[PDB]
Amino acid sequence: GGIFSAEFLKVFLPSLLLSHLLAIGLGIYIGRRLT
Amino acid sequence: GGIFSAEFLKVFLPSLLLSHLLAIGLGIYIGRRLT
Known part of the structure; x- marks a missing residue:
């Protein structure tokens, strides 16, 4: 496995999820704001 | 100071921007089809 693995993954796996x-x-807010 | 590092960043730094x-x-599409 990796060096940090848990540590790095602990702040990498969820980070990406939030981003996506x-x-x-954001897209929804923009669209719903249209009409 | 790792295995990939270079080869990793070449497909890690840009990937993030594309993801967002x-x-x-995606959101915009779904939102525009709300009301």
Whole structure:
């Protein structure tokens, strides 16, 4: 495995999820704001 | 100071930007088809 593995993954696996998910939210806000 | 490092960054730094941009796009599509 990796050196940090848990440590690095602990702050990498969820970080990405938030980025993608959060991004989706933005799109919705923009769209719903259209009409 | 790792195995990939260089080869890793070459496909790690840009991937993030694409993820967010692509993600936001998804939201916009879904949102525009709300009301």
